[PDB]
Amino acid sequence: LPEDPKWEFPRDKLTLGKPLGQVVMAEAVGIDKDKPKEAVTVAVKMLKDDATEKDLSDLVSEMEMMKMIGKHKNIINLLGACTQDGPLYVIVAYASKGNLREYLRARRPPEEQMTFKDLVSCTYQLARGMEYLASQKCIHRDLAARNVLVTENNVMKIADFGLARDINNIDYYKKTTNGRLPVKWMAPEALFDRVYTHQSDVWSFGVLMWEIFTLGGSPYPGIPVEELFKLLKEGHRMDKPANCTNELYMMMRDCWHAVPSQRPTFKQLVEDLDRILTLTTN
């Protein structure tokens, strides 16, 4: 691996620990160049023993994407990496509350339940992360509750960029394109036309939204993967989650528009959500 000084982190400064590809917790001393002696708790992603060549290159891509994206409030951020003489170590910010799916399912009505606002806030936050990601010419392609981390202060952090690509890094029209994307969150164009764009990410965003308001339910319950796309073409769409306003549900439905350009843009989702959230507070 090419030596990238700015990101490189001393292995002797890194203390591995409990597990959380493969991710583990760890103490990174002085990782923050503004407290050279302070041991910071971080999360380290690495290869498992049964790793394959593709696994390695996927982890290397995930890391490089994290370098290109830049910093943002709603995006899990890279703290550094151990890429010389030894196992590849991608060191990122540690989210104590774990992933969003486990998180939501965790506080379901009999923990500390989630208010309507808390849900709306969660959605608004992720829309910002994506709105940003899109301004960075980056497509995630793997948006889902399980790929969102939640901090101690309940800040939503989008993670798992193993599949994220630059808008131009996609072989439009080839059969192999989009073959590794979980279908229940995947936009039809991704498969039928073998293309992927920001609008494809909004479709996924719609499913993530449905996941949030169902407090972590599983999309298209009872519907097999092998039969989904047929139904999706026949027009099928998930039902308005339990306690979910018809407004937020129509928002989801819009994300699930068959015509990619008729779906809202992340910028638009952000403004609507910002409106809903604000009026909720008042």
Next chain:
Amino acid sequence: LPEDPKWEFPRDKLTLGKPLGQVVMAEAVGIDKDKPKEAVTVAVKMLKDDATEKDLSDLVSEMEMMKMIGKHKNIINLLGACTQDGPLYVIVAYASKGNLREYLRARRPEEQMTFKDLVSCTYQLARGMEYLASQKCIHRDLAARNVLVTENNVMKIADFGLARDINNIDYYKKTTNGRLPVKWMAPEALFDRVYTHQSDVWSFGVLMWEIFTLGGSPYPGIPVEELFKLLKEGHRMDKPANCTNELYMMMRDCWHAVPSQRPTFKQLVEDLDRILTLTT
């Protein structure tokens, strides 16, 4: 998905259960056509809720492979499948004792393994691979975790998700063999982008090392990232503790750098047969 009558199984007769790609235990009624009203406990492989397109093509390929391979005492066997109107269910015999790796780590000094057991366990698998080799099929993912053991401690090779017909390999293309766990993988599979029955013999060698270490993890301490450079420089695992020099020499043969210089499964069988009869 094509309608293949010979293997199809009525969904109503199937009853999924506790979990064991994704595998779950199940009750298949009259899956054994000689006992139309007897319900047989079987294992069912299906896709997961977060499945991807490739996952499906992969499961489908797994099934077809088993269809073409045929039956053999040391290969887990396909019992039938639900391929029409609904999820894809690949039904296979149920190995009551789990995967060889767990099985072995379990009885570590819960009733210990004797040398002869290890030798037998080895021989059974060698017969499995010899048969596979004769069916012109490369496994590509041979490893203790991928071997199931039935109630009668019979060894059954399983996990055919990456197995291809010898001729169905994209010789020399960069992407070839990019999904095979490197620590069981043969050098050439990566350095020349090819795969032959001889690559499988290498994996088998690693399998042998697993068996005799009673479930050890290959190349302990050596990270995947720096394995292939060591392999190139001639690095090879040391003799497992409770393993005969003879058996270890056999492992090293399986790990000869030159593929044509590694034993064939037929030979592996014969020697193992010879060593085993003597242990008995």
